[PDB]
């Protein structure tokens, strides 16, 4: 059982998520 | 059992999600 | 059992999702 | 048992999903 | 048992889905 | 323009969905 | 324009969703 | 424009969602 | 433009979500 | 523009979320 | 007289998991 | 007279996990 | 007379985990 | 006379974990 | 006469963990 | 000699939104 | 000799929003 | 000789928002 | 000789917001 | 000889906000 992962990212301008996990509620009652 | 994954991304301008997991509720009651 | 996956993406301007998993509720009660 | 997959994408302007999995509720009660 | 798959896509302007899986509810009660 | 809807449900044991909207990806690349 | 909706549910044991909206990714790359 | 909604739920034992919106990633790279 | 919503819930034992919005990542890289 | 919402909940034992918004990462790199 | 809807549910028994 | 909706739920029993 | 909604829930029993 | 909503919930018993 | 909402909850019993 | 796959994409132009 | 896959993408131009 | 995968991406130009 | 993967990305230009 | 992975990224330019 062997798992290998490789990631290479190049970003000029970032306004969002890269390799990220985001949670937002924004709920209304 | 062997799993290999490779990722290469080039982004000029990012406004969304790249290799990301996002959750948004935006619910209304 | 062997699994190999390769990904190469080039993006100018991103407003959505690339290699991403997104969840949105936007429900109304 | 061997599985091989290769992906190459070139995107100018993205407003939707590329290699992505999206879920949206948008339900109404 | 061997499975090989290759994908090459070139996109100018995207407003929908490319190599993507999308789910939308949009249900009404 | 008038819309009227009425729902009545009686459930002993639930393992699935009742009056629900579910989305599952379970995709593989 | 008028919309009226009524819901009545009785549940003994719940393991799933009742009047709910659920999203699950469970994707693999 | 008028919208009216009424909900009544009786639950013995809950292990899932009632009138809820849930998001789960559970993704793998 | 008028919106009216009414909710009444009775719960013996709760292990999940009632009238709630939950987000969980549980992602792996 | 008028919005009215009413909530009434009775809980014996609570182990989860009632009228709540919860976020959990639980991610792994 | 009914000009709307009448829904009746009656269950006699027990639920065991 | 009913011009709306009437919903009735009656359960006689016990729930055991 | 009802021009709205009437919802009635009656449970007779006990819940044991 | 009801032009709104009427919600009633009645539970007779105990909850044991 | 109701032009709003009426909510009633009645529980007879005890909760034991 | 090819026993696999060869995919070639060539685009000459510009994309304007 | 190729027993796998070769994918080539070449774009000459500019992207303007 | 290739028994795996070779992916090449070449972009000549500029991105302006 | 490749029994794995080879990924190459080349971009010539500038990004302006 | 590659039995793993080789990743190369080259960018020539500047980023201006």
Author numbering:
A (entry chain Q), B (entry chain M), C (entry chain I), D (entry chain E), E (entry chain A), F (entry chain B), ...: 9 to 37
K (entry chain D), L (entry chain H), M (entry chain L), N (entry chain P), O (entry chain T), P (entry chain C), ...: 21 to 37
Paper's wording?
Human islet amyloid polypeptide (IAPP) is a 37-residue polypeptide hormone that is co-secreted with insulin from pancreatic β cells and plays an essential role in glycemic regulation. IAPP forms amyloid deposits in the pancreas of >90% of individuals with T2D.43–45 A single genetic mutation resulting in a serine to glycine substitution at residue 20 (IAPP-S20G) is associated with familial, early-onset T2D.46,47 Recently, cryo-EM structures of IAPP amyloid fibrils assembled in vitro for the wild-type (WT)48–50 sequence and IAPP-S20G48 have been determined, as well as those of patient-seeded WT IAPP. Here, we used cryo-EM to determine structures of amyloid fibrils at different times during in vitro fibrillation of a disease-related variant of human islet amyloid polypeptide (IAPP-S20G). Strikingly, the fibrils formed in the lag, growth, and plateau phases have different structures, with new forms appearing and others disappearing as fibrillation proceeds.
Upon initial examination of the cryo-EM images for the 22-week sample, the fibrils appeared similar to those at 6 weeks, with almost all fibrils displaying ~36 or ~48 nm crossovers. However, 2D classification revealed that the sample at 22 weeks is less polymorphic than at the 6-week time point. The increased proportion of 4PFLU fibril segments enabled the structure of this fibril form to be solved to 3.1 Å resolution. Low-resolution maps confirm the presence of the entire U-fold from residue 11 in the external chains of this fibril structure. The L-lineage fibrils undergo a similar trend, with two distinct 4PFL forms found in the plateau phase (4PFLU and 4PFLJ). For example, 36% of the dataset shows 4PF fibril structures in the 22-week plateau sample compared with 11% and 0% in the 6-week growth and 3-week lag phase samples, respectively.
